[PDB]
Amino acid sequence: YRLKAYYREGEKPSALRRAGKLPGVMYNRHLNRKVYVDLVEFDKVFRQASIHHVIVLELPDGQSLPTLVRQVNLDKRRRRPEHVDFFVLSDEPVEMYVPLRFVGTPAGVRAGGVLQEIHRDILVKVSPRNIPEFIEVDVSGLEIGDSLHASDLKLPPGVELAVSPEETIAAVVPPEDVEKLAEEA
Template structure:
């Protein structure tokens, strides 16, 4: 499960495009905390630290304890926007979370065991159909990733979502029969098979 991270923020007295631009000029990223039955709260984050958190991975599945002028709130990022040219964060949305609450998140899939797959050893290729799975889960139980092993798989074999070990009480947004990964024949052989009839036709 992902660890809760700490982040410092300051309250923003003004909102709107002009106020947001002023915040960015000061080396900060405008953000908002919403949900939990409370009014939305405009805040500002250190821009460099926010960028590192986003590009460090798992940002949208990580819980944060945000300290705003001495008051700490537990939140999870729900969205962020990047500058289309410079790729630095220009806004972040955080959702307040409470015990017993559930959230819907995308959890990445990590495929392992390729070296122990007979299909791969014989030239087959690992084809990842789903790079992540959407689940509904309690925030404290969000996994960093789902690990799926293709060890033992032959060419033509596939793994479905039913092999995923979900956290307690979590639910998949897709059916348990959804294909996650499969071992496909080598592309070179497929190309050769396609060219063979054409070559025979020319000889005829």
């Protein structure tokens, strides 16, 4: 959705940050300049739209331009967000990480077993004109001891792939019990 923005100049990080803002550096193919936004609404809004969806940041320079983030670079010590980078919107064969929602209640589950998800945001491609929001996929007939993955996922028509694709998406695993302390021996 919509967020603020401001053109950045030759100012240094800490200032913008420790004040109550956060700097960025947008680009797209033929672009690479520097920008920034405000903190509180950044933090808040990133919970919702995020890299899950598309951002439409408003520049006071006029153009309320829609882009996408990516690269965010934490401070790693007493940490939190500390420098988002921005790719800009196009229509070319672009790639990103689509969020997911695995739905249902299968057979490994219920008995006590537990799913091991290996991906929620996934490596795929599309044209930004498309809006393949967040893919909600299959978890009906699952069983412990087996795995599902690869090119076995649903496609909102058009969306091509970008992996190998035998990348393991998930697998159901046998839980942990204090009878593994019988192994403690």
